[PDB]
Design a protein around this nucleic acid. Structure first.
Lengths: 147, 125, 119, 52, 51, 48, 186, 52
RNA sequence: AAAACUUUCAGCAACGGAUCUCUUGGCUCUCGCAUCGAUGAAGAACGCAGCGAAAUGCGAUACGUAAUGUGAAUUG
RNA sequence: AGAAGCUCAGACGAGUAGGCAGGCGUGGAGGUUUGUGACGAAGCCUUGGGCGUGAGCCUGGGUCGAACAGCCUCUAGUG
RNA sequence: UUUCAAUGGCCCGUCUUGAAACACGGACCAAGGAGUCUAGCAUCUAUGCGAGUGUUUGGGUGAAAAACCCAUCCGCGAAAUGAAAGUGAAUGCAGGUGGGAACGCCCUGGCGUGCACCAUCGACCGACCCGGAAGUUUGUCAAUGGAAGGGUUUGAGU
RNA sequence: AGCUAAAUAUUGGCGAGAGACCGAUAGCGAACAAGUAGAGUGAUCGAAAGAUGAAAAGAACUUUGAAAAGAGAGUUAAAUAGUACGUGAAAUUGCUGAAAGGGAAGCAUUGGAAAUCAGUCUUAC
């Protein structure tokens, strides 16, 4: 609100907490990001390096949708399934192997961080890492590419 | 509580409507209750005051005073009642105005329009 | 739960609490001390007793843990219309087992009410 | 003063539901009803439920 | 002149933006208006589905 | 669960009773209710 | 006149929770009595951690508790785990071991998984009955500096901390002072 | 029961809503402090307001 | 050095119009509506009442005529 | 034992710029107090009394004539 | 309360090393009169939920600008790295070591045990510098592809 | 080459309903005879100003005075409401009482003097 703020405690104090020797002036140091190479260089160099100059090549008319590729790791593949499917298939030897379509989960690539249980599993995806596939095949499952 | 949104609850608007009411609207604003005999005879609780009516003062310093309505003085929301007067210093007499809600009608000056008004307001004659 | 009630009503809004500028008075119709405190908090104590005055007649109120859900039968009434001494022994008897230290407080309260009644 | 001041203020729906459940629980405690200012010294039971 | 921690300010507010502030105080009113128009269309177009 | 009595139009107790809903066992939080009430009571204000 | 360095020196301590939670104050009131009527360092530390704030009480996880209680030698057995904070679920572990945790809050997933798979969930007051001196209890803490603020604290020349930047990309604090091709790297 | 549900079973009229869990199982702290489980181990109580 | 005078305090009386209470006003928001003019508009000027300067209203049919409604006033 | 309470002991106390904390006062909003009021509310005057370190608060008498306040929270065109 | 006597007491505010200042402003009184709101950001704190989170763009529902409820998206977070092409995180109980909260055992220590946090030594991921094993087909001699392995380089990583 | 409803906008006009808005130095410049009075060749500039009482019942009459008025009386709940009208602050002013004073005054501290005043007590046991 307003009643638990300052300017309710500086009522009576001259200068309102901005000092006498220097005062509260409008823009004594410049407006906005003015500086950065002339008199704000100390703050800019020590707290925002890399701010000035160009790095890299431009891309004209960039569109994010063709680049859309969220990634999921192996340690979340079984959580992508419903609880009933995990109960039916995790740790149980069956002729029919559970399938996870990570694309319907919102993922464009399956990454290999984490461990995967020993039960066989079918992973349907667009992209996959090299050792992500190695662990899936190690766990007895297969990776099928989706497009 | 009022549930219509065509009617206003604003004090500003209600006071403005009352004090800016034209003469025809003030006619209904100046309404008086009927006496018990008239109420049981006409099945009417209240009628607007008319000149020549017979009334009795029910509140104020003139409580109980009776007389014929000499003029319903609409622009001040006052009733002037015969013999309800005040003695000025110089010796003349000035009328004392009584609000219509502070009197009770004991005899109506019946016209055929007043009879139509009575039977139109769920009454009989 | 009794502590929940005190933390809700004791330090903040309560219809029987009268806070003025440095102190708390408890006018609650079933308190003895007249001050606000859990030990003496009538609503937040399930087993507690009081005295109040009525038309020359003294009244002792009690309430238990069993009837908490029913406010109508929650408090129990007894009336006294005898001299002070006997009125004292009644509170002594009625409280020699029930509150713990309310015996002395309601003896003090009964004292002040009987001075009221004579005046 | 400006019209584009923030008049309405957001509460998480879960915290709104928390408060509603807490208030219903509070209504089920006779001591809180008396403390808030309700003259329930003679009502038969809390919560007071009447027939349909 | 920028001496505090945090990211460098980026406020695009160097035009006359107060002239073009858009408020939503008519959001409940528009919602009711759309409801009434939808119901008016529902009653007017007969058995035919509204969509 | 504890049961609650049902009262007729004449104030008498009816035989039918209801179990206490689980909502009455919820935590009672005056601070959180006050904070939500503080905010919700600002949602019908008109601008000035 | 006395030559004293400083006068009236309070150090840093919190004497009560800044929270206005009635039930937290009830637990604090219990552990105030327990700390000062017992010689238990456990009770004193529980009282101090009840005073602590949200950033000073990081959430602990089911798997982290399982990891800490299954450390080779360990001898964690059936000893109850005590954390002054929230216990969050870890979906990544597919089987939850039989565990006993006492905590301020359990997330709905974490509480369901613990009860469904083995052990029990306790509040800090129930712990005060079973182990009123905190005997055979594994007191654990969350990672205080896993908070995002510590990813930025101490930023400077050659400190390798995260700068406060509005966006991530080739245009955002990446050219001068960040690589040798543009003047220097700092 | 349909409107608010329980703390372990979902409400029918509120989706994926469960009644909140308290941080303390029993709020009767005085009786829990004065219980035998606590007073059987707490060291002998020091004096109250002490003589000077 | 007593009075006068000057200053202070209090009472009463002046000067002044603060304060308190009010409010047919303003401000802001929402809802609904779409209708100026060569068939003379917006605006301006001069007039018009038994007794009127202004405001309000009207145009030599001039604080208005007709028609419709109400039903007995207007009022200094 | 308004445990946010009670109690014991020791050391200590200057301060501009400045930081922090707890309080006093004002207009409006929610709740509350069987709240005060034409048998005199608000305001105003006072060589009356009382409280607080203080911001202030209460009261006797005079004037006056229509509304106003305590407490818990909300808020601000708040000294 | 008033007045007297004794002692003490310069005119306040302001910039200033320094104001009683022969430095500035102030004849007097009443009323008005200056760190606000908004879009962000950062620390801290409170609350809810928590690998999730956010109902209020809308729709439903209320006769009502409130409250209540709600599908699908989406924001932020759950992955980084590089200019890009691209690749993309367990040798180990998700390692050692040092100090460490709490606990246990023993007779004050000792012994275990080690959360949190730092010091440090590694392991892994991306770039950078080498190294080119398969494998793919098209140029098979090749074209393309990148494995093992090495640097003690680097990242706002695991 | 061309037309086209709906969803969208709306500091104006018109009709409504509101408000954690302002309360007569505020809120629109204007609550009132306000874009008025007044200013400027002109473009333009642009105020101040709400409150007797329930009712004028607005003070008949006698008396003094050239009159204005005063003094009685009268009206009223009230003229400590008389239109110079609710309440009526301060600056500043006159009267009265008290006090002080040899080229400032004010203040602080301590007590005297004079005026003024409360508590306490009287009782309870």
């Amino acid at each position: 609100p307003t009643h638990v703020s300052k300017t309710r405690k500086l009522r009576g104090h001259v200068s309102a907490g901005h000092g006498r020797i220097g005062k509260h002036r409008k823009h004594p140091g410049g407006r906005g990001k003015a500086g950065g190479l002339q008199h704000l260089r100390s703050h800019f160099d020590k707290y925002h390096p890399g701010y000035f100059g160009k790095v890299g090549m431009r891309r004209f008319h960039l569109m994010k949708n063709p680049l859309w590729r969220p990634t999921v790791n192996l340690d979340r593949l079984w959580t992508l399934l419903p609880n009933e499917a995990r109960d039916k298939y995790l740790g149980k030897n069956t002729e029919v192997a559970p399938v996870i379509n990570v694309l319907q989960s919102g993922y464009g690539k399956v990454l290999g961080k984490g461990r995967l249980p020993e039960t066989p599993v079918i992973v349907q995806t667009r992209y996959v890492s090299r050792r992500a596939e190695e662990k899936i095949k190690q766990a007895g499952g297969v990776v099928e590419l989706i497009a | 509580m009022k549930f219509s949104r065509d009617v206003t609850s604003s004090r500003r608007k209600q006071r403005k409507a009352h004090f800016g009411a034209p003469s025809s609207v003030r006619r209904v604003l100046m309404s008086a209750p009927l006496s018990k005999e008239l109420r049981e005879q006409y099945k009417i609780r209240s009628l607007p005051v008319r000149r020549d009516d017979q009334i009795t003062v029910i509140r104020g310093s003139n409580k109980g005073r009776e007389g014929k309505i000499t003029s319903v003085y609409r622009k001040k929301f006052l009733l002037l009642i015969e013999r309800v007067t005040r003695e000025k210093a110089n010796g003349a007499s000035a009328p004392v105005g009584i609000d219509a809600s502070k009197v009770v009608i004991t005899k109506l000056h019946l016209d055929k329009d007043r009879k139509d008004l009575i039977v139109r307001k769920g009454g009989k004659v | 739960q009794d502590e929940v009630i005190w933390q809700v009503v004791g330090h903040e809004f309560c219809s029987y609490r009268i806070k003025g500028e440095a102190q708390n008075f408890c006018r609650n119709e079933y308190n003895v001390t007249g001050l606000c405190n859990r030990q003496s908090c009538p609503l937040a104590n399930s087993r507690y007793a009081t005295v109040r005055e009525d038309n020359g007649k003294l009244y002792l109120y009690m309430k238990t843990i069993e009837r908490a859900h029913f406010p109508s039968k929650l408090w129990q009434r007894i009336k006294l219309s005898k001299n002070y001494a006997k009125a004292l022994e009644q509170i002594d008897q009625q409280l020699l087992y029930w509150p713990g230290r309310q015996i002395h407080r309601c003896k003090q309260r009964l004292t002040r009410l009987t001075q009221y009644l004579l005046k | 003063t400006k019209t584009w001041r923030k008049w309405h203020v957001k509460v998480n729906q879960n915290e709104k539901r928390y408060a509603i459940a807490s208030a219903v629980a509070a209504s089920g405690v006779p001591s809180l009803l008396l403390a808030r200012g309700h003259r329930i010294e003679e009502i038969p039971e809390v919560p007071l439920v009447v027939d349909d | 002149a920028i001496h505090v921690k945090g990211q460098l300010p980026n406020a695009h507010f160097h035009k006359d933006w107060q002239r073009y502030v858009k408020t939503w105080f008519n959001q409940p009113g528009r919602k009711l208006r759309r409801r009434q128009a939808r119901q008016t269309k529902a009653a007017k177009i007969a058995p035919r589905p509204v969509e | 669960r504890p049961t609650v009595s049902i009262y007729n139009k004449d104030g008498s107790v009816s035989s039918e009773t209801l179990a206490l809903p689980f909502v009455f066992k919820a935590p009672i939080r005056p601070d959180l209710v006050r904070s939500v009430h503080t905010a919700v009571a600002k949602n019908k204000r008109q601008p000035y | 006149g006395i030559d004293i360095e400083r006068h009236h020196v309070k150090k840093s301590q919190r004497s009560k929770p800044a929270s206005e939670n009635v039930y937290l104050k009830l637990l604090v009131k219990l552990y105030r009595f327990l700390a000062r009527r017992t010689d238990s360092r456990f009770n004193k530390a529980i009282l101090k951690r009840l005073f602590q704030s949200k950033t000073n009480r990081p959430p602990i996880s089911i798997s982290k508790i399982a990891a800490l209680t299954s450390r080779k030698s360990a001898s964690s057995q059936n000893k109850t785990t005590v954390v002054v904070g929230t216990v969050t679920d870890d979906e990544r572990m597919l089987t939850v071991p039989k565990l006993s945790i006492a905590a301020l809050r359990f997330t709905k997933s974490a509480r369901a998984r613990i009860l469904k798979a083995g052990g029990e969930v306790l509040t800090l007051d129930q712990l005060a009955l079973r182990a009123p001196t905190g005997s055979n209890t594994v007191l654990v803490r969350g990672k205080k500096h896993a908070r995002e603020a510590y990813r930025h604290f101490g930023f400077g020349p050659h400190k390798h901390k995260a700068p406060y930047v509005r966006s991530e990309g080739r245009k955002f604090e990446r050219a001068r002072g960040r690589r040798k091709s543009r003047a220097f790297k700092v | 029961d349909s409107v608010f549900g329980s703390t372990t079973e979902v409400a029918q009229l509120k989706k994926n809503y469960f009644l909140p869990e308290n941080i303390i199982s029993n709020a009767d702290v005085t009786r829990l402090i004065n219980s035998d489980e606590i007073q059987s181990i707490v060291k002998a109580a020091g004096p109250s307001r002490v003589k000077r």
